[PDB]
Amino acid sequence: PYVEIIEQPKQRGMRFRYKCEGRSAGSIPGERSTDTTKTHPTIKINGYTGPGTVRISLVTKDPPHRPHPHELVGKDCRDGYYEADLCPDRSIHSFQNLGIQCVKKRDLEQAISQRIQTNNNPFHVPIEEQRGDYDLNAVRLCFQVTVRDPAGRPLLLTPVLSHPIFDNRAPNTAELKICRVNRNSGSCLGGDEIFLLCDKVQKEDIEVYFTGPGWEARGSFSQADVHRQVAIVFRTPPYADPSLQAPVRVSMQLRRPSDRELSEPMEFQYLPD
Amino acid sequence: PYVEIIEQPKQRGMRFRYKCEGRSAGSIPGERSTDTTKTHPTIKINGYTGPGTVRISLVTKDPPHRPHPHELVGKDCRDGYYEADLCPDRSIHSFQNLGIQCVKKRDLEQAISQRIQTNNNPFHVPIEEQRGDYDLNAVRLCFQVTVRDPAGRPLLLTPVLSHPIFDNRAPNTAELKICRVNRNSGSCLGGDEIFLLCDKVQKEDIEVYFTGPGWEARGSFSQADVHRQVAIVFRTPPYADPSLQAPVRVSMQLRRPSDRELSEPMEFQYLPD
Amino acid sequence: PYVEIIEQPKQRGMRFRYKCEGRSAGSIPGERSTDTTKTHPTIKINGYTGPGTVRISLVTKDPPHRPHPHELVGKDCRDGYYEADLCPDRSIHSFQNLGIQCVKKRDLEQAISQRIQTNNNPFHVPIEEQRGDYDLNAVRLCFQVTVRDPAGRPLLLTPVLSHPIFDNRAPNTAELKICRVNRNSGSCLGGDEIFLLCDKVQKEDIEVYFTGPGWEARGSFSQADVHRQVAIVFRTPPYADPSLQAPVRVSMQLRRPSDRELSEPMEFQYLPD
Amino acid sequence: PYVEIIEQPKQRGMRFRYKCEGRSAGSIPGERSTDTTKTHPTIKINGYTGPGTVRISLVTKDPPHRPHPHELVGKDCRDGYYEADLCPDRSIHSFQNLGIQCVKKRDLEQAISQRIQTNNNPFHVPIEEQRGDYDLNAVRLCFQVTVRDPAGRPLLLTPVLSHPIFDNRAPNTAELKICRVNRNSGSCLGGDEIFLLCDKVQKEDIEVYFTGPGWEARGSFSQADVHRQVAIVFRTPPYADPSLQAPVRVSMQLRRPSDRELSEPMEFQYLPD
DNA sequence: TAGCGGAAATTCCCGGGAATTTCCGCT
DNA sequence: TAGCGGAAATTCCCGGGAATTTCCGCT
């Protein structure tokens, strides 16, 4: 039998809370999970449907997957990992009680110690190679399931990894979102100053991406146009049709060239001169 | 000798009062307990009809029937449980004094201790499993009859559980019902704002469920769209066919993902653009 | 010399926090104090401008002004009252560190004891008459100033009382505020159903008040149109002009006939049939 | 003999560095200093010009000048205070090595103890009043000069206080400055949306202040209009005359009601409808 | 040099909104 | 009477946004 992540965790959005912060109920939202309803990381067990055990731990993002320092607070959680009995009912299993607790650099060494001192190494990585530098800005979920063979003897399935979950605090991995704009319409020739407010962004890695029917332009602005990483004053690019008859509505949104990530689309109609 | 439940306790309809509400507290009614006539939880002992004693305690409604924190107040009750000597000349015994006194979360920890300290564990469940989260909104009656073996010495019979009993106090148990709506018709494309008023609901656990001929959509709204748990402003979802000729009437209703419960259906016709 | 309250405290808005709640920095906002900038209770001293002392305490709302049970937490506060040296600079004195801490009924008797046991009776009321039933839903600020005569001898001025301050708990005295509306425009003839959501209100004492250029109408709705005190479905009244040429924007807001109180105004434009 | 402050320290500008921050030592400049001519806090002793010693400590900016928790780092400093022997052949003494090292809230309690343990109390304020709340964003320099009486024995002179010194990095006391604006002109009737970007500001304590010939209005915006404390979207207020013939240029700037501080003025011309 | 100043890396705190207790009408 | 039920009066809690510490560029 093998494990399958039918419901991946939301890669962006939530921010790793610290131990000091009076938080713990925090739960990793499902990939789908919308503002209306939130889904939760779910895995399916193909080839089995009886009693068993499931352990969830955190690992590095890069190929060398070592026990990540951050802990995993929540229900059935201890020493940084999740571990509860598997429900014999069906092969479907979802988790809504998974909270990520990022540790401080001071307690970085101590964190990694408990990992192996508690034997929380899912990929059995050499203690020599695991040591180095960790990216406390992103993590991965490691589903370690253990079922039973036809006879009833423990059967440890092959560990599976989920898509990386970044922390919503770093302007580079954080989620892009436009909050407000001074105007949502301009000449088809462009050149109209736009004051849009958004979330923390990298002025050396961000851009106003315009899209439409097989078309795509970009906002004009130098790094000096990004105010405190939350505001961008740019100029509207000229529309494909430098002389349209009627107004045309296109989609505007923030883009991050690094990981070619996009923000939520925003309606923007072009007006003829 | 075995114990048989003749009259199960009424499932729901009665909330779990606090110690402070004793002044206006009640007793557990019978299953088939009408209002004109009153019946109470009754059991039957077959294979013995002489001297003996009965112990009634409260356990969880889940598989691991652990000692429930709530207490069982009433005549012949003590330390959260009931216990007395049953008629040595009757095989059927009814109980019309049993009362459920829910404990406060603050005194919940000690409550479990008292359950163990007095050996109120009828299923001999390891204390290791008696520290997790308990469902303070449901309970099961555990009848522990002790007769006298064919010789004359005490003979504890196999414990018998009753049906789950839930109190109306529980927030997520309230019945779903739509009271009023601003409009009952909209474009087949959806997107029409709907102001519906209903009863107390969980903004983190509720949704506008649309149904029809092998079809089902959902209303669009964030938690911030639920006003004081009695009003929900949402957008109508796009019907199956995004371009119907004539109007189509579907069923709309509130749904609670937790227990997949539904409210009373409401007629809603879709209109072509 | 006499004391003058040039800056009364906001009668409604803030809610008395309990001792358990991790709050204390709470400060009574000035009567003016808007969302932008907040003013603070200020008093002017006419006939004096040198060194002195000022004590602020809480008293009953009704004529029999007795030491109110609630305490006054904040800077220079002890035993439930405020007392700091008066600043010789000028005759103006404002307080932004005044926080109200409401006590529980259990500690009601104990609260009143400390009042007189600490001799915090500003109006010297007979211990016999002060005892009775207290109102924990409203209080008054008692400014007890003590200056110096031309010679330099202590001069206790006449205590002054500030307007009542009710807790935003009870609707009749709570603050009125419209949260959301299905539409903000209708025919000049009126009759358009309006679904507005607001805060707790008295269905027997509330009304949708329309205002404009020397004009004022009212929403139409029976008590049965008020859903759980937070929603009101009413009909728009016919605007003064029964046939205007262009749209006219008027102000809409909730009104409470009891104390003729109003909520925040809301823009509403009338449209010709 | 008395001490006189010749050169007061600059109030704004410099910010309090913590123990961790080393590189930027810091040196309190004189209020009458410039880039071309750096001046520093200077005092003058009149009535003596021989041997002696000077002690400089930090006290609160409020009436009860208690020993401030912050330390005074720099040359000839120790235990939060400065102290050295001044030139026995000069009546004027300047200090260009004084630095303010703010302490952390965690070590704030002990800091006060150190102040007392070393008798760093120049105003002999009872330790009873040295436990309340502290404003660690403002401080006053307390010059404690000790000369030699006409005889030759030590003679402590009356302590002299300086003007306050505010922490530039302190949010509530930082410098106000408008960086960019979407438009600098609008109708004399007002109501034009303005997107202005500035530095860190308190959304609960900030306002767009308009001024002119014996006139002054204010921008309209709720706290929800302040984006990440660096952007404010407000509406232009109506000018003194709602129907002017020609354009009128007034001054616009940020204002902070707390300390009624202002930002650099900005030209803004009003245009007739 | 000595710093300034922007930005991450920790910690805190408040406005609400609810759930949790308690109290009291009303058959 | 016996209980429903509803409101109160208390207590919790979440989302944020901030603040506070610390870091490091850069000249």
Tab-separated table of C-alpha atoms (C1' of nucleotides) in Angstrom, chain D residues 18 21 23 104-105 169 200 202-203 228-229, chain F residues 16-26:
chain	number	residue	atom	x	y	z
D	18	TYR	CA	19.938	49.015	22.682
D	21	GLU	CA	23.571	47.669	18.828
D	23	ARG	CA	28.609	50.060	15.854
D	104	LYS	CA	14.692	46.160	27.476
D	105	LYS	CA	11.393	45.736	29.288
D	169	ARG	CA	12.611	55.304	16.465
D	200	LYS	CA	5.441	55.270	10.159
D	202	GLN	CA	-0.215	55.976	14.448
D	203	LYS	CA	-3.567	55.401	12.733
D	228	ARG	CA	0.522	49.825	7.042
D	229	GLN	CA	1.168	53.137	8.804
F	16	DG	C1'	-5.174	40.776	12.869
F	17	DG	C1'	-2.264	44.763	13.386
F	18	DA	C1'	1.284	46.580	15.678
F	19	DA	C1'	5.451	46.897	18.807
F	20	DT	C1'	9.639	45.741	20.277
F	21	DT	C1'	14.024	43.801	19.780
F	22	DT	C1'	17.714	42.673	16.786
F	23	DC	C1'	20.116	42.436	12.613
F	24	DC	C1'	22.816	44.288	8.650
F	25	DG	C1'	23.497	46.779	4.934
F	26	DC	C1'	25.737	51.205	3.443
